Design a protein around this ligand. Structure first.
Ligand SMILES: *[C@@H]1O[C@H](CO)[C@@H](O[C@@H]2O[C@H](CO)[C@@H](O[C@@H]3O[C@H](CO)[C@@H](O)[C@H](O)[C@@H]3O)[C@H](O)[C@H]2NC(C)=O)[C@H](O)[C@H]1NC(C)=O
Ligand SMILES: *[C@@H]1O[C@H](CO)[C@@H](O[C@@H]2O[C@H](CO)[C@@H](O[C@@H]3O[C@H](CO)[C@@H](O)[C@H](O)[C@@H]3O)[C@H](O)[C@H]2NC(C)=O)[C@H](O)[C@H]1NC(C)=O
Ligand SMILES: *[C@@H]1O[C@H](CO)[C@@H](O[C@@H]2O[C@H](CO)[C@@H](O)[C@H](O)[C@H]2NC(C)=O)[C@H](O)[C@H]1NC(C)=O
Ligand SMILES: *[C@@H]1O[C@H](CO)[C@@H](O[C@@H]2O[C@H](CO)[C@@H](O)[C@H](O)[C@H]2NC(C)=O)[C@H](O)[C@H]1NC(C)=O
Ligand SMILES: *[C@@H]1O[C@H](CO)[C@@H](O)[C@H](O)[C@H]1NC(C)=O
Ligand SMILES: *[C@@H]1O[C@H](CO)[C@@H](O)[C@H](O)[C@H]1NC(C)=O
Ligand SMILES: *[C@@H]1O[C@H](CO)[C@@H](O)[C@H](O)[C@H]1NC(C)=O
Ligand SMILES: *[C@@H]1O[C@H](CO)[C@@H](O)[C@H](O)[C@H]1NC(C)=O
Ligand SMILES: *[C@@H]1O[C@H](CO)[C@@H](O)[C@H](O)[C@H]1NC(C)=O
Ligand SMILES: *[C@@H]1O[C@H](CO)[C@@H](O)[C@H](O)[C@H]1NC(C)=O
Ligand SMILES: *[C@@H]1O[C@H](CO)[C@@H](O)[C@H](O)[C@H]1NC(C)=O
Ligand SMILES: *[C@@H]1O[C@H](CO)[C@@H](O)[C@H](O)[C@H]1NC(C)=O
Ligand SMILES: [Ca+2]
Ligand SMILES: [Ca+2]
Ligand SMILES: [Cl-]
Ligand SMILES: [Cl-]
Ligand code: NA
Ligand code: NA
Ligand SMILES: [Zn+2]
Ligand SMILES: [Zn+2]
Ligand SMILES: [Zn+2]
Ligand SMILES: [Zn+2]
Lengths: 692, 692
């Protein structure tokens, strides 16, 4: 038989290991020759593996790179102007790689150039609430200061936007051992902890789904018209640079002004974590100075697009996608995912060599420039939006397969909950002490949902990865899955030079059994999605979360009873819409089960309803000021791009509403958002009614 | 057999006459009780005719009405302030109707209230070029003046926008006998000409596809959140009123200042057509004063939606739609169309009673509030956008069946050219002297295309009617057809009380044979569209017009060679895209002919490609500042809503470009629009490539 079990048993841990080792010997930074060569390799091997076509799709996009002859760094400088302290120029390379060249030094991608100088202020995680604390309660003013903030909690881009909206003239990011050093574990090479000389790279854009900063809406092709830098989307206007905890200790040890306001502003370094501004008395006339000489430049990037044509519905597309570019070696991010996708492609190809084809078309992608803002996926989706809108069944992402070795992590649309539950009951748990148990069982035991005894946690999709365009812009049902750590107690070597094949083989997954599990989940999902006769989506799962979401957003609004009375703020229409969806979805399931199994057209009609249901939640006007976030139920949090927010139009219109100077207008906009949500939920529901 | 000929022979001229008489005894103004009652009647009779379901869909939209106890009118007023001249309060009612009540008097719908007073300026047709002439060459300044303009050439809304952007404080519209009185024909009741006391009603919004001014994007339902009047879409900010040529003669006979600049500013009244400002010497201190007391109010409107479920593809929708509301009796506009749709419904129902069903679903609509801005169609499409986007095959409009008795007029998407050519070769010409000839032959002889010997003229779709939302917002293939007058030499009684059943029966179509022809064309189109196994669209027809359009827009740009060199303005990408479309379309036709006729899925795939092709030309970002005009190839002219413009993003960016103060920026935007167009044409083309 050529069935799922066939596909699944053909997958090998050992192949995944080889591929990972092969993908991590040299750096594969976006836009560099080596990442082009790795693209040519994937392309040619997807061809050898049997795909019907494998092409490169290239775009010319805005990237960012340090100046090789003029390095970035930060100083303490004295009243004369002598730089008595310099941050490092590079991370100590790890054992055996100390002669690899082309290790990009730590930098904040897309920082503008500058040499500002001034007094520090320490802003904790640079969250929206951290600035509230700072401005509102503590009365400290960051205007014209240089803020220093620890990584963690939120996407670094948000941090930078917040600092900028607070009047800062520079930002310094560092990794605190409280957030990046697990107790009792050694620093790399002897453990998986971050060393004091380790630094996290990463971009600091606020793109809000735009893709290439120069070409929002349209693929960055050869004739593309490009905005000028000044109209570019998402670029920070103050310089920014990241450092390790050794360098940070030196910047923080002299801090004066006010004490931290409480213990949650305190990391683990032996320093006061005073907030500032400026240094204490003896050193009060010393200053901090940044030297940033990074350049932005339009650079060519290459996606690899593989096609396995479907036998019955070739005009329906299941997409398995993940990126190939890395900040350095990408031992985890992303090559632990890419090696999984490679083996998934190999296994699908093995069946195809024996004459099998999936029912629907499967598209396989190796995206470029993800690290620089999801630019490869997004340009490609901008280019093929019409095909994807009308033919796209689902998108399964495939970035890092592990960030932990404790349990499975799944984030996806409600429409895929049941598929995930089912797939995992059929899969072996790789966990110590669940030998012979199902993956469902181990996952459900180690990671239970808040809502339902006997069910595992499944998160909602945030952003910060290549499914963003497919889900929040286009309304294609999306999911992702990986191994992760204990939810109670990213990973410490995230985006640092220390993230290597040895990191993975020695400390995360020596047997490659977690990787293999993750290949089964990803691959199994894609298999079901590309092969089940009826698409494996359950609309009733959407009905349940919508109720939960409407309860939640109503509760936020109920913190303002007085205002709800004065302005006649009602959630009746939303609750009505969600009830209707529940009823209609339920009648649709009955039909989907009772229908005349033999009829292709009726089957196609009902599959089209399932396929267009996610699509139904798209509003072609977008959310306010974020035209590329069009999904009404899910957007990335406006305070944290990694986190998903439900009913975001309403959440944001309620956020901090008590601080608005014109309440009438603000509550007017809450009501508008309520209407949009109710309408959209009703409209979605109606796509599941009988069609005529 | 139950084939087209069956459908077509069941249609009767005599039934159309009865229905027309039945629809025109009383006024059916949007929002009034009588138009609700006519809706209940249509609904109940579509039920008796056999449709599977017939519902009313209602919305609460902004309308506009004169104050019944405080009438609008215009005065000449003297230095004291005595109103020595008053325009009429109503049109003389026609013979036999002089006791009908509820004849809304002439008014400009959506005019704000006011009593401005000042000197006249006469601005010819109030076209963009007329104001150019006036400001640029003649150096006359309309700021703070009251402009008077004759109807004709362009949509009255544009006229009003132009006057307003010229600083006017009021606008007076009138019908000049040069534009509304055909020589040698009597005034109504004794001919079809407009009498001196006749006046053209009509709205004066600039909605740009928005629908209800208060709820752009979303259906005006019970819980809808509504903008305040001040943020409403499309409302004029100066008062406006329309008058007949008797009243206009009195306003124009005293005009002084400058002479008309040439003979094309001269109508047929015996007055100088001086431009002004103000009156000549003796009367130089007299003034013109408007009294406008119209109110805008949210009012309920009712569409009637009839469904004839398809046997094979019930989830594919062919829509036959036209409006039911009238300014007064609607003898031509719209009941000459509505009576045709009624008979079309009856005939389809006759076949269904005998057990036949169309292959795809047919939806029949009687729209409300078309006269007030296409509001019924648009709200309904806003509400069902998701269904329509994914299931909509085509939309055939059905407003007035005749505006003439000389020949056929067709305006439609290129995709329906071949269907129209074929249908009409099978239809009898109703024309004197083409007895026994085909409709194609008479049409082709009386109305030849500019481009091809042996082919008839087919216009491109403009706007000013209910297909606007379906075509330019949603990208559903649309057409329309009616009898019209000689293209060499609207109709004079357009939007006046004189437009009655007697007008039609006596002077336009005594035999109802032109009506019947138009029912065959409309109905025949809908029949083919709902029944042919392969959708009757030819993508190669799009390829030919795109070349023609690209030649045209290139020629406009070539009036500025110097600027094309300085700014590197190239049309290469557009021409490349159009070539590609041509090639790909051609390969698709070969497949569409060669494919395995027996396979439902392959048939469905290829029909979906045909169906989504029009959809492919939609840009979800819209055109600049006109977010509800999303089609890249066709928009309504920005200077005339009735006329279609091809490549409108580029046309508008080239318009008047030599007057822009920052050429670099302006030519930057030409290039941007070029890129958008090229990209979109390529993307559309690619929807017709093999799918995998
Ligand atoms: C959830 O589904 C129900 C249908 O079972 C929807 O009920 C509809 O609710 C509106 C009120 O918001 C009703 O409007 C009323 O229509 C009558 C004419 O039939 C009119 O006289 C009233 O002034 C009023 O406008 C409507 O009849 C009712 N529709 C049906 C088919 O029963 C409800 O709206 C849905 N919820 C949402 C958010 O869509
Ligand atoms: C019309 O269709 C043709 C395909 O037959 C398109 O040709 C493509 O044109 C672009 C140039 O604009 C070519 O780009 C080049 O790619 C190579 C790598 O293969 C690279 O070295 C060059 O610097 C350059 O970017 C592209 O290869 C060529 N594509 C193919 C498949 O031949 C043309 O773009 C289409 N026109 C439009 C407007 O889309
Ligand atoms: C997940 O698994 C269950 C199999 O238990 C599926 O539910 C059953 O599906 C069949 C229809 O094929 C019905 O006759 C049964 O009544 C269903 N049982 C229950 C409890 O619902 C469910 O369909 C699967 N989900 C997905 C997405 O496949
Ligand atoms: C309009 O009419 C012609 C019928 O002459 C159609 O063209 C023919 O269609 C069949 C495919 O059914 C081909 O085998 C012939 O080769 C075609 N002839 C020509 C000259 O093209 C055309 O398909 C019809 N158009 C539409 C929309 O139906
Ligand atoms: C990866 O594998 C390919 C082919 O098997 C090979 O050409 C290339 O040398 C490999 N890379 C490394 C680092 O071994
Ligand atoms: C890098 O800096 C050096 C001087 O220290 C300079 O010559 C060069 O312009 C810079 N390179 C870029 C790409 O900006
Ligand atoms: C820091 O860097 C600059 C430039 O290389 C130099 O002038 C200064 O001495 C350095 N300071 C220290 C303390 O090493
Ligand atoms: C792998 O397994 C054990 C937990 O059972 C743990 O002690 C070790 O921390 C895990 N490795 C990593 C990198 O989390
Ligand atoms: C139109 O026809 C219907 C039913 O045949 C009837 O109830 C109504 O009276 C008619 N209207 C007129 C003006 O005759
Ligand atoms: C109509 O005008 C009269 C007075 O001349 C006034 O009482 C009334 O307010 C007006 N009606 C409306 C709806 O504005
Ligand atoms: C015009 O109308 C007003 C108000 O009805 C009146 O005072 C005036 O006499 C009228 N003028 C003429 C010339 O009939
Ligand atoms: C109808 O027919 C004849 C032209 O043959 C024409 O003289 C008359 O004007 C036409 N009627 C109208 C309303 O155009
Ligand atoms: Ca882009
Ligand atoms: Ca609306
Ligand atoms: Cl992932
Ligand atoms: Cl029409
Ligand atoms: Na999760
Ligand atoms: Na025409
Ligand atoms: Zn990654
Ligand atoms: Zn990353
Ligand atoms: Zn009309
Ligand atoms: Zn009209």
């Amino acid at each position: 038989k050529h069935n799922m079990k066939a596909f699944l048993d053909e997958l090998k841990a050992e192949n995944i290991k080889k591929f990972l080792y092969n993908f991590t010997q040299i750096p594969h930074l976006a836009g560099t020759e080596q990442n082009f060569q790795l693209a040519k390799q994937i392309q040619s091997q997807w061809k050898e593996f049997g795909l019907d076509s494998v092409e490169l799709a290239h775009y010319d996009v805005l990237l960012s790179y340090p100046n090789k002859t003029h390095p970035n760094y930060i100083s303490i400088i004295n009243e004369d102007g002598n730089e008595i302290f310099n941050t490092s120029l590079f991370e100590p390379p790890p054992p055996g790689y100390e002669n690899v060249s082309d290790i990009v030094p730590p930098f904040s991608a897309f920082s503008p150039q500058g040499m500002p100088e001034g007094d520090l202020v320490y802003v904790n995680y640079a969250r929206t609430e951290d600035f509230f604390k700072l401005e509102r309660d503590m009365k400290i003013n960051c205007s014209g200061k240089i803020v220093i903030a620890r990584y963690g909690k939120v996407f670094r881009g948000n941090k930078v936007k917040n600092a900028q909206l607070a009047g800062a003239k520079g930002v310094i990011l560092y990794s605190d051992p409280a957030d990046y050093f697990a107790p009792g574990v050694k620093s790399y090479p002897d453990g998986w902890n971050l060393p004091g000389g380790g630094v996290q790279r990463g971009n600091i854009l606020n793109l809000n789904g735009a893709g290439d900063p120069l070409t929002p809406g349209y693929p960055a092709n050869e004739y593309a018209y490009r905005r000028g830098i000044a109209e570019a989307v998402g670029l920070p206007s103050i310089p920014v640079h990241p450092i390790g905890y050794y360098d940070a200790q030196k910047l923080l040890e002299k801090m004066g002004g006010s004490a931290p306001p409480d213990s949650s502003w305190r990391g683990s370094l032996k320093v006061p974590y005073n907030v500032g501004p400026g240094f204490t008395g003896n050193f009060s006339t010393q200053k901090v100075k940044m030297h940033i000489h990074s350049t932005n430049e339009v650079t060519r990037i290459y996606n690899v697009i593989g096609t396995l044509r479907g036998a019955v519905e070739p005009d329906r597309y299941v997409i398995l996608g993940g990126h190939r570019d890395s900040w350095v070696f990408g031992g985890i991010d992303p090559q632990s995912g890419a090696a999984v996708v490679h083996e998934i492609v190999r296994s699908f190809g093995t069946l195809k060599k024996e004459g099998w084809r999936p029912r629907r078309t499967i598209l396989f992608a190796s995206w470029d420039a993800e690290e620089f803002g999801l630019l490869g996926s997004t340009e490609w989706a901008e280019e093929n939006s019409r095909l994807l809108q009308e033919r796209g069944v689902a998108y399964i992402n495939a970035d890092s397969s592990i960030e932990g070795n404790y349990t499975l992590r799944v984030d996806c649309t409600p429409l895929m909950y049941s598929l995930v539950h089912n797939l995992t009951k059929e899969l072996k748990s790789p966990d110590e002490g669940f030998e012979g148990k199902s993956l469902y069982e181990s996952w459900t035991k180690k990671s239970p949902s808040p809502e339902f005894s006997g069910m595992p946690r499944i998160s909602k999709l945030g952003s910060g990865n290549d499914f963003e365009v497919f889900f929040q812009r286009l309304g294609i049902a999306s999911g992702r899955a990986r191994y992760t750590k204990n939810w109670e107690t990213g990973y410490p070597l995230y985006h640092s030079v220390y993230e290597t094949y040895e990191l993975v083989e020695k400390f995360y997954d020596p047997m490659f059994k977690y990787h293999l599990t993750v290949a089964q989940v990803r691959g199994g999902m894609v298999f079901e999605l590309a092969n089940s006769i009826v698409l494996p989506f359950d609309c009733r799962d959407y009905a349940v979360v919508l109720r939960k979401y409407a309860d939640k957003i109503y509760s936020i609004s109920m913190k303002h009873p007085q205002e709800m009375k004065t302005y006649s703020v009602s959630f009746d229409s939303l609750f009505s819409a969600v009830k209707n969806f529940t009823e209609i979805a339920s009648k649709f399931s009955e039909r989907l089960q009772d229908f005349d199994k033999s009829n292709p057209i009726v089957l196609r009609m009902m599959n089209d309803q399932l396929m267009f249901l996610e699509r139904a939640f798209i509003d072609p006007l977008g959310l306010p000021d974020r035209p590329f976030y069009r999904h009404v139920i899910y957007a990335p949090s406006s305070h944290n791009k990694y986190a998903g927010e439900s009913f975001p139009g309403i959440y944001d219109a309620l956020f901090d509403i008590e601080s608005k100077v014109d309440p009438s207008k603000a509550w007017g906009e809450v009501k508008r958002q309520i209407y949009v949500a109710a309408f959209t939920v009703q409209a979605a529901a109606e796509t599941l009614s009988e069609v005529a």
